Design a protein around this nucleic acid. Sequence first.
RNA 1: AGAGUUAAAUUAUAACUAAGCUGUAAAAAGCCCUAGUUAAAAUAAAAUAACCCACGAAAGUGACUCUAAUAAUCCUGACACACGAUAGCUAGGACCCAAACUGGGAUUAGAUACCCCACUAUGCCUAGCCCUAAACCCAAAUAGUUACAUAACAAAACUAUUCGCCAGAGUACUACUCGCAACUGCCUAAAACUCAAAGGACUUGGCGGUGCUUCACAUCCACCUAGAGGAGCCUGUUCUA
Lengths: 208, 71, 96, 137, 86, 116, 23
Amino acid sequence: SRYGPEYKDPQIDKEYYRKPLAEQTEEEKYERDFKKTQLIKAAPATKTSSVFEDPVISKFTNMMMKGGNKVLARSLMTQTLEAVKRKQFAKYHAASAEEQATIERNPYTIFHQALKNCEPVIGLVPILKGGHFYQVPVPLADRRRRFLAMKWMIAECREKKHRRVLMPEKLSQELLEAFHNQGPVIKRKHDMHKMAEANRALAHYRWW
Amino acid sequence: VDYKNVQLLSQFISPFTGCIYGRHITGLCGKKQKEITKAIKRAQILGFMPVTYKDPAYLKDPKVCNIKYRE
Amino acid sequence: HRFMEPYLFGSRLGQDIIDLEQTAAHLQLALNFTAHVAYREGIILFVSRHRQFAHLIETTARDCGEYAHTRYFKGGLLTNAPLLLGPGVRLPDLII
Amino acid sequence: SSFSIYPPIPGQENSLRWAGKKFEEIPIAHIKASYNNTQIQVVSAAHQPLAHASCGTEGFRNAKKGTGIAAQTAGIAAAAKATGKGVTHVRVVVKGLGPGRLSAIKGLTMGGLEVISITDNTPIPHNGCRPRKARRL
Amino acid sequence: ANHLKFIARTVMVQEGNVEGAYRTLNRILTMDGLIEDIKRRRYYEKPCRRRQRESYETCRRIYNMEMARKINFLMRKNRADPWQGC
Amino acid sequence: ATPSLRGRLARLGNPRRPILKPNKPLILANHVGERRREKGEATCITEMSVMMACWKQNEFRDEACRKEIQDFFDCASRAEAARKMRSIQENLGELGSLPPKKLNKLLHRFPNKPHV
Amino acid sequence: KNILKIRRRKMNHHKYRKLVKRT
RNA sequence: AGAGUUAAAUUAUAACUAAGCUGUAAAAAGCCCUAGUUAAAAUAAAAUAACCCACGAAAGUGACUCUAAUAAUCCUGACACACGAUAGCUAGGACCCAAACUGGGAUUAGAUACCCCACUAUGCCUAGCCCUAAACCCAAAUAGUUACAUAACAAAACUAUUCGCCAGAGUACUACUCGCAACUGCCUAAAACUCAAAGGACUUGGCGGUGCUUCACAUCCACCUAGAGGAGCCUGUUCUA
Ligand SMILES: [Mg+2]
Ligand SMILES: [Mg+2]
Ligand SMILES: [Mg+2]
Ligand SMILES: [Mg+2]
Ligand SMILES: [Mg+2]
Ligand SMILES: [Mg+2]
Ligand SMILES: [Mg+2]
Ligand SMILES: [Mg+2]
Ligand SMILES: [Mg+2]
Ligand SMILES: [Mg+2]
Ligand SMILES: [Mg+2]
Ligand SMILES: [Mg+2]
Ligand SMILES: [Mg+2]
Ligand SMILES: [Mg+2]
Ligand SMILES: [Mg+2]
Ligand SMILES: [Mg+2]
Ligand SMILES: [Mg+2]
Ligand SMILES: [Mg+2]
Ligand SMILES: [Mg+2]
Ligand SMILES: [Mg+2]
Ligand SMILES: [Mg+2]
Ligand SMILES: [Mg+2]
Ligand SMILES: [Mg+2]
Ligand SMILES: [Mg+2]
Ligand SMILES: [Mg+2]
Ligand SMILES: [Mg+2]
Ligand SMILES: [Mg+2]
Ligand SMILES: [Mg+2]
Ligand SMILES: [Mg+2]
């Protein structure tokens, strides 16, 4: 908040600025953007015009970080991606042509699919009625479900590993297990869905 | 107003319920609202007119009442 | 209004008809007084709060060389003159 | 298109058929909707019981079975057991004013069953028995 | 009970839409006070409580009626004002 | 038409006995009340129950039913859009009537006279 | 307000009735 | 006041069908000789009309029919005469449903309460008692006036004729008396003693486990991050010394 409310967030996308001539409403829109004499916040250190950066990978990176270490967390993220890659190459060369057509070697699509598989559909909020606290099923917003997915991942791969075991190892393990739906993280998501069905009547207590 | 004629009476009754409409609905002098009422009650217990619904036969008679159910 | 009845000629079909004989008799004396006040060099204020004729009245008073308050009347205006208007003041010798 | 909200009187010539049957021949779904529970029973026009489903029958328990979700579940279960005996259409009779009225009705609809008429028969004394005393003296 | 069944408090569904039919029904019952009476009869209300309720309701109705009447009588004068900044 | 006020209240002249006992005096106030905000109820419960039946049947594998999950999500989005966009338009448009503020101003322009 | 008087009488009477019961 | 009648419920009781039904903020206990639907007497109570404002002296009276019937050529008037809601009493009959009491179940520190279930006196009919209510519209009856005129609040202010009442607060709808089908009753109704006030209306606050709006931006809930409370030490309190 060293920026007044006057300051708009920057649009970092290059493709937007490079190819303007085919869209009327957007031409009018960013015309109104700069011509309004609108101040713009200085673009963040984390965010780049890079063609190689995934916002989700960056969020997970941040969520891994302890203290002020961007270096150590980016390190463990890099190492985990590399570990998933090489684990899938090791799984690729020991297989046969069919399974060489099937198996995915992209650590990015494995990350995104593992997290989409690990995100919960529905959730639980406590509600006070008649001097008792009842756990009630609540539909969740998208961002909340993504968050829950990532946080559950980091929670498990921090907590449940043996102390000898390194982080990129355990994390790549669980990324590949949650890709295939068989990981303890998806078991947690299932505990949530089962506790959301056990209480389903109590869905009337929700007033919103 | 005569208890013997069920048509005129059942004009002032709610079709679905069998209730008697009030003044704000029928729009009568107090005298005639009274009269209609007493008449209805008498015709109902003497066995001329049904209590719990308007007799289907009289459904399509002129509607004099101000109520609108279906909107 | 109850005090208006001696001034009414009568009521024609619910509308009240003011007796214009009395109206003339009164308006005579009113104009008489008003002129005598202006003759002796004293301040005449036209007061109305009605927004139709506000402009008309302000115009009228400006053209008689007289003063008009047609606006929202400030609370202590006549009672507490010295504070609202100034250190010492003259007050209207007649108000219309 | 002339559509009457009012039903087809028996003595009338009126021709409307649902699967060829007269309005009178259609089975009846009785829904008792009470504050603590909802019971549903589908019956022949001849008053022979076809199907019975309740919120208790549906494996809910005390407070839970009051809710509209439970009513809907019982409605679906009822419509299933009823279509098993092959009833396509039904006339609904709703007895009582409670949490499970509408839920049990559209739970009959959701349960793959067709509702033609919806009647409300709720006991309305013209002053019979005095009801029990008000709570919080 | 001794009356013929299905002639009263009955609505026929149109084109298979049940929700609108039930709505029509509920509006009927509410119109005739049947709902308020169903609700009021769940517990006995002692004659004096009743008397009080009726008196209050009638007062309420008088006030509401009269207020709505002054509203609609005054509604014309909500138009944009002619004399603005006079 | 308005229910009659003749002979209803207890007064020194009145022959009969009171019908109405007014809690507070019946005089038209120079303002109206503020609209009562609607009591909220649970939304999407139907689609939820459908989805939960789907789950109970298919043993809680999400891959099994992709329709009920997507439709519950769709419904929740329509409920959010409802909550956000309905607040403003329900707080402004009264349909055939006026917002309580304008009504009050109007009434203050033409006040009830108890006095005089 | 006036209820204070009524409360006094209420209590007195109650007490007295209790007394008659005992005595 | 009599006599006759019953639409909606509800129930004995069968007939199918279902294993549960009932009950709460939530449960337990209860019931499964239960529940839903289809049949149904008796009993009791009288939706809507009624946004009406009638009848009766008051209490009261609002399902239907009929009989009988609502004093005074109309001032006031008792301790005399006749009535008088609910509860209660005596005797006989009824009993659907409700329900003091009581017994179970919860709640709670306790809960001889509020909440849940069961059941009784009692509510109903006949006959006789009892004679009280915040029996208050806290505004006497009969004639008038809208003149003079605002303590406050409330239902604006007053004249005339009457009757009934009222002389600080408690003590006291009490003790003692008379009378009374009342015998834990009603009625009538003091004093010793105690106090210097007791009261009525208002004003401005504060408060409210009171209602309606609008909010909380590290902030209550929902939610994010890191810690404290457990270990050792460091340092400060409290005790003991
Ligand atoms: Mg009490
Ligand atoms: Mg009278
Ligand atoms: Mg009051
Ligand atoms: Mg005392
Ligand atoms: Mg008798
Ligand atoms: Mg019957
Ligand atoms: Mg019996
Ligand atoms: Mg048990
Ligand atoms: Mg009746
Ligand atoms: Mg007479
Ligand atoms: Mg006399
Ligand atoms: Mg008595
Ligand atoms: Mg007896
Ligand atoms: Mg008994
Ligand atoms: Mg009971
Ligand atoms: Mg006990
Ligand atoms: Mg008795
Ligand atoms: Mg009384
Ligand atoms: Mg008195
Ligand atoms: Mg007298
Ligand atoms: Mg004394
Ligand atoms: Mg007494
Ligand atoms: Mg005594
Ligand atoms: Mg003595
Ligand atoms: Mg904080
Ligand atoms: Mg630390
Ligand atoms: Mg710690
Ligand atoms: Mg420590
Ligand atoms: Mg110290």
